[PDB]
Design a protein around this ligand. Structure first.
Ligand SMILES: C=CC(C)(C)OC[C@H]1O[C@H](O[C@@H]2C3=C([C@H](C)COC(C)=O)C[C@H](O)[C@]3(C)/C=C3/[C@@H](COC)CC[C@H]3[C@@H](C)[C@H]2O)[C@H](O)[C@@H](OC(C)=O)[C@@H]1O
Ligand SMILES: C=CC(C)(C)OC[C@H]1O[C@H](O[C@@H]2C3=C([C@H](C)COC(C)=O)C[C@H](O)[C@]3(C)/C=C3/[C@@H](COC)CC[C@H]3[C@@H](C)[C@H]2O)[C@H](O)[C@@H](OC(C)=O)[C@@H]1O
Ligand SMILES: [Cl-]
Ligand SMILES: [Cl-]
Ligand SMILES: [Mg+2]
Ligand SMILES: [Mg+2]
Ligand SMILES: [Mg+2]
Ligand SMILES: [Mg+2]
Lengths: 5, 235, 235, 5
C-alpha cells in the first residue's frame, strides 16, 4: 500500500 | 451558508466533538463554516480542517476504487450487465469531485492568499496539491493533463517554500514531500523522481534529528516511517 | 421518491454494489427505493435492506454514545462549556430518530402487512423491534415507556411466530432471540429475563445441530457464539 | 461488549 499523509 | 448563524468558537468546538465521534462529514461542514467567518485559521484549526476532508474524500476514493475495479472487470468473457455499474461509479465520482471542488474553493477563498507564515502557506498549498491529485485520480477527459499540472504547480510552490523556510524535520515539510513523491509515482508516471525525492527527504531528516527534543516530533517520525514504507514498496 | 425513475432490478443491483463499496447510506436509499416499488422482497433482498440500515444506524448510535458520554461528564467539578455539546448530541440524535422513523414507516408500508411466510414475517417484526429499541436507547421524555412497549410488542409477536413455525437453529429465530435478550438486558431492566432467554435459546439450538447439513448453517453458529458471548459477559 | 445481530 502506497501511503500518503 | 447553513453555518452562518453559528459562532466561530462553537463551530471549532463542534468540529472537535465530531472528530471524537468520527463524524467527519459534520467535522468538514463545521470547519467550512469556520473558514467562511473570514479569519485566518490557527495551527490547530488548520489540522481540524485537513483531517476532516482527508477522511471524507478518503472514503469516497476507496469506494470509487472498488466500483472502478468492478467496472474494469465488466469490460474484460464478462457478461453485459447493463449501465448500472458505470452509473453508480459516476455517482460516487461526481460526489468526490464536488468535495474536491469545495476544498479547492475554500483554499482559493481565501486561505492561500491570506497566509503569510511559511507553515500555513505550505500547509494550504499541500492541500491544494492533494485535492487536485484526487481529481486527477479519476480524470479521463481533456482536462486530465491540466489537472495533473495544477497539482504539480501547487506541490512545487509548497516545496520551494518549505526548503527555504523550514527545517528538514518539519512535519508539514515532510508530509508535503511524501505526498509529492506519491504524486510522481501514481499520477505523473515518474517513479524515479518519486524514489529520489523520498530518499533525499528521508536522509535529510535523519541527519537533523539530533537537533530535536525528545517526544516533540512524533508526527515527523510517523511520516519518516511512511517515506521508508513507500521506498521499500517501490524498490 | 428520488428512486422512482429507476428500475427495481437496477436498485437491487446498485444496492449490492454499494454493499461491496461499504457505502451503506446509498445502499439504504437503493433498498428503500426497491421496497417502494410495491413488490415483496425475496430472502436475499430482505438481507440487503436490513444490513444497510443496521450499518447506517449503527454509526449514528456509536456517535450518539460518544457525545452523550461527553455530555454526561459535562454535567458532573466540570467547567461550563455552554450549549454546544447538547446541541450537537441533539443534532445526531434527531438524525438517528429520522432514520428509525424511515425504517419503521417502510415496515408499516407495507412489508409487515404483506408478509405471509413465517421467515419474512419474523424478519420484519425483528426489525421493527430493533428500530423501536434504538429509539428507546435515546428516549428520555414522556414517550420512553411507550417506545419500550412498542419494541417489546414487536419482539414478542416475532418470538411467538418463530417458536411455532421455525426450527430452533433457524438463523432468523436465533437472531430475534439474541436481540430480544439484549432488549431485556439494556432497555427493559430485566437482566434475569435476558439471561434465561439467551440460555434456553442457546441450549435448544445446540440440541438440534444434529439435524443440520455441514457448512449450511455458518450464520446460526455465529449467532450462537454471540449468545454465548453475552452470557459470559452477563454471568 | 453486548452483541446484537
Ligand atoms: C484532528 C486533529 C488531531 C487528532 C487533534 O491532531 C491530529 C495531529 O495533528 C498534528 O499532526 C499533523 C497531522 C498528522 C500526523 C502525521 C499524525 O501524527 C501522529 C503521531 O499521529 C496526521 C494528520 O492528518 C495531520 C493533521 C496532517 C498533516 C498533513 C496535512 O497536510 C495539509 C502534513 C503533515 C501532517 C502534519 C500537519 C502533522 O503535524 C499533531 O502534531 C499530531 O500530534 C502528534 C502527537 O503528533 C496530531 O495527531
Ligand atoms: C448484505 C448481504 C450479504 C453480505 C450478501 O449477506 C449477509 C448475510 O446474510 C445471511 O445471513 C443473515 C445475516 C447475518 C449472519 C449472522 C452473518 O453470518 C455470517 C457467517 O457472516 C448478519 C447480517 O446482518 C444478516 C443479514 C442479518 C440477520 C438478522 C436480520 O434481522 C432482521 C437476523 C439474523 C440474521 C440472519 C438473517 C442471517 O441469515 C447469509 O446467510 C450470510 O451468509 C453466511 C455464509 O452465513 C450472509 O453473510
Ligand atoms: Cl446511481
Ligand atoms: Cl449542532
Ligand atoms: Mg461572532
Ligand atoms: Mg465522471
Ligand atoms: Mg419496471
Ligand atoms: Mg432529542
Amino acid at each position: 500500500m502506497t501511503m500518503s499523509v | 451558508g447553513a453555518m452562518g448563524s453559528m459562532e466561530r468558537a462553537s463551530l471549532i468546538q463542534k468540529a472537535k466533538l465530531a472528530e471524537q465521534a468520527e463524524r467527519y462529514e459534520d467535522m468538514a461542514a463545521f470547519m467550512k463554516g469556520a473558514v467562511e467567518k473570514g479569519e485566518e485559521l490557527s495551527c490547530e484549526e488548520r489540522n481540524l480542517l485537513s483531517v476532516a476532508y482527508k477522511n471524507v474524500v478518503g472514503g469516497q476514493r476507496a469506494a470509487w476504487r472498488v466500483l472502478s475495479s468492478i467496472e474494469q472487470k465488466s469490460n474484460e468473457g464478462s457478461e453485459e450487465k447493463g449501465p448500472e455499474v458505470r452509473e453508480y461509479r459516476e455517482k460516487v465520482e461526481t460526489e468526490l469531485q464536488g468535495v474536491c471542488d469545495t476544498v479547492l474553493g475554500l483554499l482559493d477563498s481565501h486561505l492561500i492568499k491570506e497566509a503569510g507564515d511559511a507553515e500555513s502557506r505550505v500547509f494550504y498549498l499541500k492541500m491544494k496539491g492533494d485535492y487536485y491529485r484526487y481529481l486527477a485520480e479519476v480524470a479521463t477527459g481533456d482536462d486530465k493533463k491540466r489537472i495533473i499540472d495544477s497539482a504539480r504547480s501547487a506541490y512545487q510552490e509548497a516545496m520551494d517554500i518549505s526548503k527555504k523556510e523550514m527545517p528538514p524535520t518539519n512535519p508539514i515539510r515532510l508530509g508535503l514531500a511524501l505526498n509529492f513523491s506519491v504524486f510522481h509515482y501514481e499520477i505523473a508516471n515518474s517513479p524515479e523522481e518519486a524514489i529520489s525525492l523520498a530518499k533525499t527527504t528521508f536522509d535529510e531528516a535523519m541527519a537533523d534529528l539530533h537537533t530535536l527534543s525528545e517526544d516533540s516530533y512524533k508526527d515527523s517520525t510517523l511520516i519518516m516511517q511512511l517515506l521508508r514504507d513507500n521506498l521499500t514498496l517501490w524498490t
